[PDB]
């Protein structure tokens, strides 16, 4: 993740009009999939994909 904030995003990953934004703040949230590591050794809800 980046050093900026993510609390200004909505459920769909997009910020809404009328919100104040400062430098580095995240305005578009996007993720790409990654083949999971050996974290299937057991990480109930905290294994990165």
Partner 1 sequence: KESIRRDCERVLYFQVKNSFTKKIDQAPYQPPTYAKGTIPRVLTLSFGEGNRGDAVLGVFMDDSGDVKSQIKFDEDFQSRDFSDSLTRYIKSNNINPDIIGISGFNIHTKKLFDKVNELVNEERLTIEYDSDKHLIRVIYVNDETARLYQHSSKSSAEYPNRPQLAKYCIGLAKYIQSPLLEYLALDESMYSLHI
Partner RNA sequence: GCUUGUGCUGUCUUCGUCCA
Contact residues for RNA, defined by CB under 7 A = 1-3, 24
CA distance linking residue 49 with residue 34, whole number of Å: 5
- Of 3 and 44, nearer to RNA (C-beta) is 3
- Of 20 and 46, nearer to RNA (C-beta) is 46
CA distance linking residue 34 with residue 39, whole number of Å: 13
- Of 22 and 38, nearer to partner 1 (C-beta) is 38
On whether the CB atoms of residues 19 and 25 are closer than 8 A, the answer is no
Residue numbers at the binding site for partner 1 (CB under 8 A): 38, 40-47
């Amino acid at each position: 993740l980046k050093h900026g904030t993510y609390e200004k995003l909505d459920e769909d990953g997009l910020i809404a009009p009328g919100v104040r934004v400062s430098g580095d703040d995240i305005i578009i949230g996007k993720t790409t999939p990654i083949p999971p590591d050996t974290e299937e050794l057991g990480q109930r809800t905290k294994y990165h994909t």
